[PDB]
Amino acid sequence: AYKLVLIRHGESAWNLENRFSGWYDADLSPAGHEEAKRGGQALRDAGYEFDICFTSVQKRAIRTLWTVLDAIDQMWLPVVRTWRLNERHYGGLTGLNKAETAAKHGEAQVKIWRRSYDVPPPPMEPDHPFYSNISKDRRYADLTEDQLPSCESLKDTIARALPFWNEEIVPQIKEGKRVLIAAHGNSLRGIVKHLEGLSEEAIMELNLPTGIPIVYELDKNLKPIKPMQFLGD
Amino acid sequence: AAYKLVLIRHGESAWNLENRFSGWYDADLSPAGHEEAKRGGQALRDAGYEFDICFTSVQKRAIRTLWTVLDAIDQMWLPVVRTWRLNERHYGGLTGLNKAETAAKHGEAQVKIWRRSYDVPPPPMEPDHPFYSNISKDRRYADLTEDQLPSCESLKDTIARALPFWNEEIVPQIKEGKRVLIAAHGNSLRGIVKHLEGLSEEAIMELNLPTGIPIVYELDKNLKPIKPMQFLGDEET
Numbered sequence: 391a392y393k394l395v396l397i398r399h400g401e402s403a404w405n406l407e408n409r410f411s412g413w414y415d416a417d418l419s420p421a422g423h424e425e426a427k428r429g430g431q432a433l434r435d436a437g438y439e440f441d442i443c444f445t446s447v448q449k450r451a452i453r454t455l456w457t458v459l460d461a462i463d464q465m466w467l468p469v470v471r472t473w474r475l476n477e478r479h480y481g482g483l484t485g486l487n488k489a490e491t492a493a494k495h496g497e498a499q500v501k502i503w504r505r506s507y508d509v510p511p512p513p514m515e516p517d518h519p520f521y522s523n524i525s526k527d528r529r530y531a532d533l534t535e536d537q538l539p540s541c542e543s544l545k546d547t548i549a550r551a552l553p554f555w556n557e558e559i560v561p562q563i564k565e566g567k568r569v570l571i572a573a574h575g576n577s578l579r580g581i582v583k584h585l586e587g588l589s590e591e592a593i594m595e596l597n598l599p600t601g602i603p604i605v606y607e608l609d610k611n612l613k614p615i616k617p618m619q620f621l622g623d
Numbered sequence: 624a625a626y627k628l629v630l631i632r633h634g635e636s637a638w639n640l641e642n643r644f645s646g647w648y649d650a651d652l653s654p655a656g657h658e659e660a661k662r663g664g665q666a667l668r669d670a671g672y673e674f675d676i677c678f679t680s681v682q683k684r685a686i687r688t689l690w691t692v693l694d695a696i697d698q699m700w701l702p703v704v705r706t707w708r709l710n711e712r713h714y715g716g717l718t719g720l721n722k723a724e725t726a727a728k729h730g731e732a733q734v735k736i737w738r739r740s741y742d743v744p745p746p747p748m749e750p751d752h753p754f755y756s757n758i759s760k761d762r763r764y765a766d767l768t769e770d771q772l773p774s775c776e777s778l779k780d781t782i783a784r785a786l787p788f789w790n791e792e793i794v795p796q797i798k799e800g801k802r803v804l805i806a807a808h809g810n811s812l813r814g815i816v817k818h819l820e821g822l823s824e825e826a827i828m829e830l831n832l833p834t835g836i837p838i839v840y841e842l843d844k845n846l847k848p849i850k851p852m853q854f855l856g857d858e859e860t
């Protein structure tokens with residue numbers, strides 16, 4: 391019986407989590423930091439212990455993981471950062487609010503995007519204020535032309551998340567290490583989907599809470615032995 | 624030059640405030656030590672430094688210094704490797720005692736010997752020591768061979784267990800082109816500085832590295848310093 395914990399970062403700055411933050415490396419707001427502190431406290435109260443930590447390369451996630459580790463006094467744990475856990479890449483929508491998206495592209499198209507699993511938003515073009523910021527960012531310089539996305543469908547995000555899960559995270563769990571994952575809504579979606587074998591429509595319907603420990607209890611083949619349980623009051 | 628290496632030594636801890644012996648006790652920074660790290664990182668920033676990998680102990684005063692630096696420079700994404708081999712020197716049974724308690728229990732002679740010596744360890748930390756479970760039983764050294772877990776350390780011991788990590792794990796990455804940043808402790812950094820500079824036991828013991836100040840090394844292809852360490856920061860500091 392293995393124990394796996396997910397945490398999803400809370401609010402980022404400038405209201406960006408309602409502006410398709412995506413691959414833009416927004417920091418937490420003071421609120422989102424607070425949220426992460428609460429998740430840490432929860433974990434501390436419950437006496438949890440971990441042996442390895444996995445996170446994305448985006449600082450809203452990393453800073454949540456740091457807050458948690460501090461709260462529970464395991465700042466000495468090994469930490470592995472992978473872009474494969476990055477937030478979904480929203481391409482040209484990244485930065486816009488709901489109204490600006492509708493203005494730019496129309497409510498029919500937005501609805502189609504909001505409802506599709508396989509259909510990407512329009513790519514981030516050079517005239518986008520985040521194009522160089524993200525695509526020429528030092529931290530992705532090792533990614534081949536095909537790996538570095540200009541935009542992703544939920545299918546795409548999950549596709550590039552799972553290979554890291556399988557190849558890195560699964561081995562450690564099998565070796566009995568107690569994993570903690572701090573990441574973002576859509577990458578955690580992909581993990582959960584492969585876990586609970588959910589349908590496309592089902593996963594699009596799932597919306598994981600922020601800054602809250604999500605506890606999974608697993609059997610010897612990594613299937614959950616019961617539904618996901620949360621942590622707090 | 625070919626390569627660039629940067630070290631940083633963490634600053635004031637909670638127990639420095641109490642002037643207790645920390646060693647492998649996992650004390651946090653004081654507010655002032657944290658602020659120090661913020662200044663170290665603001666310096667690194669102003670200079671424009673970039674890194675590819677970072678190294679540090681498994682003691683939170685190093686780790687938090689590292690974190691603070693990475694925040695100030697906007698490289699929180701970097702890979703980070705933690706190792707006990709970078710830990711502060713283990714002070715054995717002196718752990719938790721302050722200057723007064725050390726002197727009262729051991730006398731001027733003994734403490735002077737321990738201070739001015741390179742390979743005389745302090746007393747072992749025995750199982751009845753108030754911090755023995757706290758440290759020796761801490762689950763973070765579980766993968767340690769019985770011969771690796773010190774009860775106490777000379778400065779020699781400390782360097783002896785530090786240098787294996789340097790040689791085997793940091794050197795490769797430097798020669799790979801990876802700009803390294805090391806966040807650790809006075810004595811482990813002493814070991815690294817000693818190797819880099821070929822210093823005598825005398826000179827190394829006389830050397831006292833500043834806290835929270837980036838220490839830069841410019842290195843040729845053989846990891847030989849090409850000039851004396853530099854301190855980063857505004858003119859005064």
Ligand SMILES: O=C(O)c1c(O)cc(-c2ccc(Cl)cc2)cc1NS(=O)(=O)c1ccc(-c2ccccc2)cc1
Nearest residue numbers: 717722723725726727730731732734735737738739745
């Ligand atoms: O320079 C000094 O360190 C010193 C000294 O040489 C002599 C006296 C002294 C005067 C009067 C009386 Cl009655 C008793 C002792 C006090 C001193 N300072 S100390 O803070 O206590 C201290 C002593 C030893 C270590 C030490 C331990 C283990 C490994 C390495 C270093 C660290 C701090």
Ligand SMILES: [Cl-]
Nearest residue numbers: 468469690703
């Ligand atoms: Cl880290």
